[PDB]
Enzyme design. Structure first.
Site, short mmCIF file in Angstrom:
data_model
loop_
_atom_site.label_atom_id
_atom_site.label_comp_id
_atom_site.label_asym_id
_atom_site.label_seq_id
_atom_site.Cartn_x
_atom_site.Cartn_y
_atom_site.Cartn_z
N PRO A 1 0.88 -1.19 0.00
CA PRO A 1 0.00 0.00 0.00
C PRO A 1 0.91 1.24 0.00
CG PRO A 1 0.29 -0.74 2.23
CD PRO A 1 1.01 -1.76 1.38
N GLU A 2 0.64 2.12 -0.97
CA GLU A 2 1.47 3.28 -1.21
C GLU A 2 0.81 4.56 -0.69
OE1 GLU A 2 3.18 3.00 -5.25
OE2 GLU A 2 3.29 0.82 -4.97
N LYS A 52 3.91 7.13 3.30
CA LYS A 52 3.36 5.89 3.88
C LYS A 52 3.42 5.91 5.40
CE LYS A 52 5.30 4.55 -0.07
NZ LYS A 52 6.40 3.83 -0.76
N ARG A 244 13.11 -5.08 -7.06
CA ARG A 244 11.67 -5.10 -6.96
C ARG A 244 11.09 -5.48 -8.32
NH1 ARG A 244 10.03 -1.49 -3.00
NH2 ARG A 244 8.04 -2.61 -3.28
#
Ligand code: ZN
Length: 254
Positions: A1-2, A52, A244
Site C-alpha cells: 500500500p502506497e 506511507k 523489486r
DNA sequence: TCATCCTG
DNA sequence: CAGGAGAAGC
C-alpha cells in the site's frame, strides 16, 4: 500500500473516530502499554500522513507513528465487533460507536512533539505527492537540483527522501505514462519530458487517491505482463529493477 | 536483512 | 513452506 492507499485509510480513520473521546486504548507491544491509561478520555485530533507514514495525533500532544510496510492494515469496525481474522492485532483505538484496529504492522511507536521532526524516517522524507501545496514547478526544481539531477529514476522514484508516497506501482505507472525506462536521469531529459514527468509524479498518485477506491484510475502496466499495451499494442513485460518487480512496455518506453 | 501475509 | 510482496544497514 502506497501513499494514495494510506491517505484513503487515514481518511477512513478520521471519519470513524476524529474528535470522539476514547473509551479504550490497547497496544500489543509491552513498551506502549504505558500509554493506554494516559489516552483514555483523550481524542484523536487529526490523522496526518507523510507518504506511507501515518501520524495519529491525540489531544494531549502525543502522536502514534505507524508504518504498514508491505503487510500492515487498518480496519474500521463498530465498537465491540471484531471479525474473525488470522492477522495479529497490534493497536486498538475505541470510542462509543466506532473502533479502529491496526493489524500486522511492526513499526509502531509513540512520539512526543519534538520527535515529529527528529524521528529518523520523518527527518528524511521529502515533500509529499498528495500535499496540495506541492506544485509541478517545485517538483521540476527538485528533479533538476544538484541533489537529485544525477539519480537514475529506477531507484529515485522509490526513495522517500525524493518524494514521499511513491512506491513500486506508482514508479511503474508514472514511467509508463511519460514513455521512460528507469535508466534515465533528470539532467538528460528535454524540457518537454521533464515537465511531463514533474506533472505525472503528482497527477498519477492524486488520481489514484481520488478514484481507485471507486474516468477512474486503472493500471496500465502494473501486473499486466503478457497483455497488449493499450498505447502501442506491444506485450508488456515483467522483470526486476532495483530488487523489486518491474512492469513496462518495450514498444513505447525508452 | 527485517518483518508479516499469502501464494504457487 | 520457501519465495514473493517498504525501508534501512552496510
Ligand atoms: Zn506500449
Amino acid at each position: 500500500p502506497e501513499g494514495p492507499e494510506i491517505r484513503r485509510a487515514a481518511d477512513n480513520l478520521e471519519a470513524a473516530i476524529k474528535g470522539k473521546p476514547l473509551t479504550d486504548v490497547w497496544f500489543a507491544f509491552p513498551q506502549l502499554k504505558t500509554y493506554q491509561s494516559q489516552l483514555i478520555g483523550q481524542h484523536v485530533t487529526h490523522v496526518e500522513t507523510r507518504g506511507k507514514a501515518l501520524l495519529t495525533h491525540f489531544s494531549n500532544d502525543l502522536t502514534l507513528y505507524s508504518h504498514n510496510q508491505l503487510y500492515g492494515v487498518w480496519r474500521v469496525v463498530d465498537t465491540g465487533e471484531e471479525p474473525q481474522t488470522t492477522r495479529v492485532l497490534r493497536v486498538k483505538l475505541q470510542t462509543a460507536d466506532k473502533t479502529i484496529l491496526l493489524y500486522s504492522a511492526s513499526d509502531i511507536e509513540m512520539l512526543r512533539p519534538e520527535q515529529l521532526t527528529t524521528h529518523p524516517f520523518l527527518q528524511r522524507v521529502g515533500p509529499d505527492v498528495l500535499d496540495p501545496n506541492l506544485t509541478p514547478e517545485v517538483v521540476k526544481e527538485r528533479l533538476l537540483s544538484p541533489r537529485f539531477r544525477n539519480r537514475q529514476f529506477a531507484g529515485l522514484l522509490l526513495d522517500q527522501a525524493f518524494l514521499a508516497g511513491l512506491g513500486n506501482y506508482l514508479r511503474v505507472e508514472i514511467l509508463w505514462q511519460v514513455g521512460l525506462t528507469g535508466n534515465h536521469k533528470a539532467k538528460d531529459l528535454n524540457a518537454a519530458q521533464l515537465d511531463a514527468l514533474a506533472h505525472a509524479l503528482l497527477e498519477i498518485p492524486r488520481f489514484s487517491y481520488a478514484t481507485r477506491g471507486q474516468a477512474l484510475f486503472r493500471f496500465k502496466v502494473f501486473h499486466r505482463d503478457g497483455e497488449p499495451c493499450e498505447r502501442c499494442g506491444s506485450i508488456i513485460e515483467k522483470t526486476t529493477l532495483s530488487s523489486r518487480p518491474f512492469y513496462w512496455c518495450p514498444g513505447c518506453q525508452h
